[PDB]
Design a protein around this motif. Sequence first.
Motif, PDB file in Angstrom:
ATOM      1  N   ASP B   1       0.853  -1.239   0.000  1.00 51.25           N
ATOM      2  CA  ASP B   1       0.000   0.000   0.000  1.00 51.25           C
ATOM      3  C   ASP B   1       0.873   1.268   0.000  1.00 51.25           C
ATOM      4  N   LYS B   2       0.244   2.434  -0.125  1.00 47.84           N
ATOM      5  CA  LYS B   2       0.989   3.679  -0.287  1.00 47.84           C
ATOM      6  C   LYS B   2       1.583   4.187   1.035  1.00 47.84           C
ATOM      7  N   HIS B  40       3.271   2.692  -7.587  1.00 46.60           N
ATOM      8  CA  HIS B  40       3.092   3.639  -6.493  1.00 46.60           C
ATOM      9  C   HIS B  40       3.750   4.976  -6.808  1.00 46.60           C
ATOM     10  N   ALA B  50       5.081  13.358  -3.577  1.00 44.64           N
ATOM     11  CA  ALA B  50       4.373  12.602  -2.539  1.00 44.64           C
ATOM     12  C   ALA B  50       4.892  12.871  -1.108  1.00 44.64           C
TER      13      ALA B  50
END
Lengths: 194, 196
Positions: B1-2, B40, B50
């Motif tokens: 997951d991120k 991602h 990010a």
Amino acid sequence: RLDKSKVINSALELLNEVGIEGLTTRKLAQKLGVEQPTLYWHVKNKRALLDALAIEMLDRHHTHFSPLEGESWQDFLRNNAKSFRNALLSHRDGAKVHLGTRPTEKQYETLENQLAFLTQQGFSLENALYALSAVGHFTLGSVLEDQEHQVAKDSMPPLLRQAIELFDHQGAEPAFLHGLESLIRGFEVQLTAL
Amino acid sequence: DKSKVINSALELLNEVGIEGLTTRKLAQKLGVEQPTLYWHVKNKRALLDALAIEMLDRHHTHFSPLEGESWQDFLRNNAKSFRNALLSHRDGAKVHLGTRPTEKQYETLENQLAFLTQQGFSLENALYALSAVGHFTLGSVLEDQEHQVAKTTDSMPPLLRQAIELFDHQGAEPAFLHGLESLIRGFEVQLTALLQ
């Protein structure tokens, strides 16, 4: 010395062509037509190169580093900042190149003189220091923003619309001069209170 | 997951800095192959976007005035909040540089301009006041973090010698607070001008 070589002019040109990111000692060496040990004899690594470039920009385009005598401390500050800004804009990514530069023996001479001048106007040594650093930080910051968006450059809300069109018509210089005047004016108010 | 990718990316940043940071290093830090990570984060520019956005979500918490609050206090608290986000990780200010703004940040800019104009500032004065504070703050943290990296007072001239010794004693924060007041006074003077 780098003085007697084409290393600085060649790096300055490469900088304009590829920016601080694409500028490597490898590409500079190829630009010069020489292999790396010889370039290394001139300059040891990219950080030492950027340092030299930063200082050449200042040497070539930073006119107003000490105060004209008779000049007000307000005028000195304005013209110093404009002059520093012109230096940073003289080449591509000029502000990023400046970041992390080690001051030279002359830059300390020049900064002692600047501190001497402001303390003579009744700034405590502390406030003289803070004043020059705030002008410097502000200016560096502005040019960094400016230079990153030279690259980029209705149902929309009025205020946001007005604010965008403001920067299309006027560019970054009015914002710069406005923040600079806000600083100089704020110093006067602060000095007065203390 | 991120979340895993981002937290791991933040550690790597703290370990190696903005320059040592690569998606290759991040992939071999995590368990995974590079094409796995790709979905991602495309590339270093996307990763840095990010991380910059994560430091802001986490730490830049005072982007809108809490009402009752004076425009002055808002500008102070917004600038300190922003500074905290930049200082939250190694090279935070450099990570922030060259990030493009989200639609939410533009929505925030609308609200702030609306708020300052409501106090009597022309739109141009509102807008330039906000950029001045942002640019001052960014520049400060940059030279602060840039100075932190540095790792000779007694050999340099008199005033400068005293000035720098002063800087080491009371770190970077007092200069920042003082410059933030100076902007705010300059603004207040504009507020009381017959003609802005």
